[model samples]
Each structure stands twice: as C-alpha cells, then as structure tokens.
Target: KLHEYNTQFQEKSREYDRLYEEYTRTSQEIQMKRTAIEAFNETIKIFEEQCQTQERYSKEYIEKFKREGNEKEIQRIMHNYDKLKSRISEIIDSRRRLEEDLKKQAAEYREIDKRMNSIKPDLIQLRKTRDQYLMKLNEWL
Candidate 1:
C-alpha cells in the first residue's frame, strides 16, 4: 500500500507540474496576442487619421479650384487624390486583415480559458486529495 501510494503521488505531482508549465505558456501566448492586437489598433488609428486628412484636403482643394478656376491647382489636387486612392485602399485592407487575425486569437484564448474553468472543480478535488494523502503519510513518519 505504501509503494502504491508513493507511485501515485509521484505521478500526480508530475502531472501537476506539467499543467503548471502549460498554464504559464498559454498565459504568455495570450499576452503576446493582446500586444499584437494593440499594435494593430494603433496602426488602424493612424490610417483612419490619414484618410480623414486626405478627404478634407481634397474637398478644400476642389472647392478652391472651382472658385479661382485655377487649372494648375486643379491638376495638383487631382494628383494628390490619385496618390491617396491606393494608399487608402491598402490601409483599409490591412486593417481588415489585422482585425480578423485579432478576432481569431481572441476566440482561441477564450476557448482555452473556458476549458480550464470547466476543470476547476477537478483541480480543487485533486489538490484536496493530495493534501489529505500527504497528511496521513506524515502521520506514519
């Protein structure tokens, strides 16, 4: 009985240690994903500001060209608009991709957390059992 109990304790301890390591690793991965999401949000904010600025400048330039009938100003304004068109499109595409990736990571983290929480009862029971066993073993010593 002592040998069987010793073997069982060793196995349970190893499993606890492995789970502890996995918990740390998963927690770090979640943090890294959050950091990535933050960085991507910052990038999206920058792009939105750029798009707003470009739209404002374009509208003002178009209006100025109409009032003065300045062909040179109109040409310059048209060039600016042309340059912005592609950059704005690319920025929007990037934001979409980043947000999608962020959502995926969030879902994954939630799933892992869900699984861990569901097993919380078992975790408590196992710890209680281990503590009781250790107390009885100490009584023998």
Candidate 2:
C-alpha cells in the first residue's frame, strides 16, 4: 500500500508541477496584455493632447498673423495646421482600432483566468495529498 501510494504521489507531483508552470506562463501572458493595454491608453492620451494643443496654437497663430497683416505667415500657419490635423485624424483612427483589439484580448484573458482559477483548487489539494502520502511512505521506510 505504501509503494502504491508513493507511485500515485509521484505522478500527482509531476502533474502539479506541469500545471503550475502553465499557470505561471499564462499569468505572465495576462500581465503582458495588461501592460500593452496601458501603454496603448497612454499613447492615445498623449496623441489626443497633442492634437488639442496643436489646434489651439494654430488657431491662435492664424488670428495673430491676420491681425498683423502678414499674409505669408498666415498661409504658412494654415498649411502646417492642415498637416497636423491629418496626422491627428490618423492617430485617432489607429487608437480606436487598437482599443477594440485590447478589449477582445481582455475578454480572452478573463476566460483563461477563469480556467486557471478552476484548476487551482484541484492542484492545491493534489499537492497536499501528495505531501501527506510522501510523509507516510517515508515513515515506513
């Protein structure tokens, strides 16, 4: 009986080790996903703030040049404004697409987390049982 228990405990130990490694790997992947999303969010915020700042400055520049009767400065400022607006549009569109992808990844991560949680209890119990068996078998030895 002790020998059989020892064998079972060894098998459970290997299984637990494998599952624990998988848990750790998936947990890292989830953490990476979180980091990626946070980075994306920060980038989006910076891009948005840049757009607002650029627009406000361009408007002010145009008004100031117009009042000064400097047509060349007004034209140059307008041209730059156009370029900034176009880049802002592109940034906003790309940010929106990435946001959608991040949301989907988050959902998938949650599903994986649920599976991991479900297996956790079983893994814990198996480890405890294996330890008890090991102690009993060692006492016999």
Candidate 3:
C-alpha cells in the first residue's frame, strides 16, 4: 500500500509540475506577442504620418507647377504621387492583415487561460490527496 501511494504521488506531482511549466511558458509567449503588436502599431502610425506629409508636399508642388504653366512638371509629379499612393495602400493592407492575425492569437490565449483555470482546482485537490497518502506511507515506514 505504501509503494502504491508513493508511486501515485510521484506521478501526479510530475504531471502537475509539467502543466505549471507549460502555463508559465505560454503566458510569457503571449506577453512577448503583445509587445510585438505594440511595436508594429507604432511603426504603422509613423508610416501613416509620413505618407500624409508626402501627400501634402506633392499637392503643393503640383499646384506651384500649375501656376507656372508647366504641364510637363505637373504630369511628372502626378505620376510619382500615384505610384507612392499605391505603395502606401499596400502597406496599410499588410498592417491590417497582421492586426487581424494578432487578434486571433489573443483569442487563442484566452482559450488557453480558460483551460488552465478549469484544471486549477483539480491540481489543488491532487496536492491535498498526495499529502494524505504521504503521511500514511511515512507512518508505515
């Protein structure tokens, strides 16, 4: 009986320890992911600001060429503006997709947390049961 209790305690303790470690690791990973998302958002904001400034400058230049009656320069500036606008659009789309992916990851983290919480009570009970068996085995020894 002592041997059986000892084995069961050891097994349960190992399993609990493994789960705790996994929980810690997963929590840390989620935190790092949050940091990454924040950094990416900052980058996107900066890029948007830069694009707005560029658009303003392009409009001013095009207007100046129109005042001087320079059709060639106006056309050149318009072409460059269109190209830059397309590129910025692509960048915005990419950022939007990445944000969606992060949202999905956050949802997955919530699910993992829920599962971990569900087992928490069971692990506590397991510990108490192990302690009881340990005491009995110690008395026999």
Candidate 4:
C-alpha cells in the first residue's frame, strides 16, 4: 500500500508539472495577443485621424480647383481620397479578425485553468497520503 501510494503521488506530481508548464505558456500567449491588439488599436486611431485630415484637405483643394476652373487637380484629389478610405477599411477589417481570434484564445485559456484547478486538490491529497505511509514505515524501522 505504501509503495502504491508513493507511485501514485509521483505520477500526480509529474502530471501537475506538465499542466503548470502548459498554463504558463498559454498565459504568455494571451499576453502577447493582448499587446498586439493594443498596438493595432493605436495604429487604427492614428490612421483615422490622418484620414480625417486628408478628407478636410481634399475638400479644400477641390474647392480651390473649382474656383480656378482646374478639373484635373480636382479629379486627382478625389482619387487620393478614395484610396485613403479603402486603406482605412482594410485596417478595420484586420482588427476585427484579430479580436475574434483573441476571443477563441481566451476560451482556451479558461479551459486549461479549470483543468489545473481540478487537479490541484487530488495532487495534494495523494502527497498527504503518501507522507503518512512513509511515516508509518519509518516508525516500524
């Protein structure tokens, strides 16, 4: 019985170590993803401000060209405005996809956490039982 208990405790300890490593790795991954998301958000904000400024300047230039009867410059400014709008949309779409991936990763992290929590008590109980057996054997010797 002592041998069996000791073996069980050792096995549980190994399993717990593996789970802990996995938990740490998952935690790091989540942190990196969060950091990336923050960066993306900041980039998006800057781009949006640039887009607004571009829009304002485009309007002013278009009006100026109209006053001077310059159709070519007006057309060029409008084209540049459309390109900037498209680029902004692309960045927004990328951010949305990253957020969806983060949600999935968060769910996975929770599942690992739950598994580790459940295993903890069992490991403790096994170690305690093993120690009691060891003490009994020592007393007999």
What is the C-alpha lDDT profile of model 1 across 1-141, one tens digit per residue? 445555555665566666566667767766776677677677767866876886776787688788998988788867866776677677667767766766775776576566656556655665556555442334431
Clashes of each: 0, 0, 0, 0
Candidate 2 lDDT (Cα, whole model)? 0.68
What TM-score against the true fold does each predicted structure earn? 0.50, 0.47, 0.61, 0.79
Candidate 3, 70-131: lDDT as tens digits: 99988887787687677767767776776776687677667756766766676567556656
Could you tell me how far off, in angstroms, the CA of residue 18 lies in candidate 4 after the best superposition? Answer: 2.0
- The top-ranked prediction according to TM-score is 4
Among all windows of 10 consecutive residues in model 2, the one with the lowest summed lDDT is: 132-141
lDDT for 70 in candidate 3 is 100
User: Which ranges of candidate 3 are over 4 A from the true structure?
Assistant: 1-18, 64-72, 131-141
lDDT of 4 at 86: 90
Clashing pairs in 4: none
> Which regions of candidate 1 are displaced past 4 Å?
60-141
Worst 10 residues of 1 by lDDT: 132-141
As for candidate 3, its clashing pairs are none
lDDT by residue (28-113, candidate 4, tens digit) is: 87888889999989988998898889777677777888999999988888788789889889988998988888898899889888
Which portions of model 4 show Cα errors greater than 4 Å? Answer: 66-71, 135-141
